[PDB]
Structure 1
Amino acid sequence: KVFERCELARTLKRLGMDGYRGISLANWMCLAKWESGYNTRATNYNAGDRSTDYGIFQINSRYWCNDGKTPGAVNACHLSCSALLQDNIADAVACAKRVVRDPQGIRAWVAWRNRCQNRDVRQYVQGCGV
């Protein structure tokens, strides 16, 4: 599914993302916007390293989920990468939380550094009731 902006904001809030390990909801929203355009079915094959990015947060198969086809990969979220292509984003959120428990936090995603870090991200949650 492709979420609408404010629907996603409330969905993320109910899933415990607001302020998770210091990360505001607007930062999560900016991440999802730039990774996938709020699209849970999004995928991107990385031909350079044989890994794939899955779902609304474009989480990568080398470290975080198992797809069986990424050489030498691990599965730190302990999920099939299929779980990151559901309309229901609970598993994707659990995995995103796992990612940010590691030292880099939200900086794990280069798109966040490029498109969200040191930016005014208030617009992503305006009007959404969060």
Structure 2
Amino acid sequence: KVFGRCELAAAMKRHGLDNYRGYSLGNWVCAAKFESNFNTQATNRNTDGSTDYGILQINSRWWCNDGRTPGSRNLCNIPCSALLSSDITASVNCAKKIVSDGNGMNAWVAWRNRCKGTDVQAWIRGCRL
């Protein structure tokens, strides 16, 4: 599923991301735009052999099982495929774990490079929230 901006903001808010660990909703919408272009089916292979999955591009080295990342963990206790669903529940639940890990939203390279320090509220402007 490819979300609209406000549609995604609304789903994220309902799943409790607005202000989660102090990150305003616009941070999460911004991260999703640049990680996945709001596409839940987005995948990207990394040099280390891990793969990023879903709307928040969650990586198999640590967070999910895909059966093909030797030596990896599955901290969210889910198959990576769960992160590709039209229903964002699994991605949000796992994202809450990631952002709690120690580095906050710096765990998302696109967030650090394209969202951090910008007017992130702009991502939720105009939305009925």
User: Which residue of structure 1 lines up, in the alignment, with residue 98 of structure 2?
Assistant: 99
Deviation at 1:123, TM superposition (A): 1.5
User: Which residue of structure 1 lines up, in the alignment, with residue 62 of structure 2?
Assistant: 63
Q: Which structure 2 residues correspond to residues 1-130 of structure 1 after superposition, within 5 A?
A: 1-46=1-46, 48-130=47-129
CA distance, structure 1, for counterparts of residue 121 and residue 87 of structure 2: 25
CA distance, structure 2, for counterparts of residue 120 and residue 108 of structure 1: 19
Q: Mark the runs of 5 or more structure 2 residues left unpaired by the alignment.
A: none
Q: How many residues matched?
A: 129
Q: Percent same amino acid at aligned positions? A: 60
RMSD: 0.7
The amino acid across from 1:17 in the alignment is L
Deviation at 1:64, TM superposition (A): 0.4
Q: TM-score, normalised by structure 2?
A: 0.98
Q: Mark the runs of 5 or more structure 1 residues left unpaired by the alignment.
A: none
Q: TM-score, normalised by structure 1?
A: 0.97
CA distance, structure 1, for counterparts of residue 89 and residue 108 of structure 2: 19
Deviations 1:31-73 (A, max 9, x none): 0000001000000011x21100000000000000000100100
Runs of 4+ residues over 3 Å off in structure 1: none
CA distance, structure 2, for counterparts of residue 37 and residue 29 of structure 1: 10
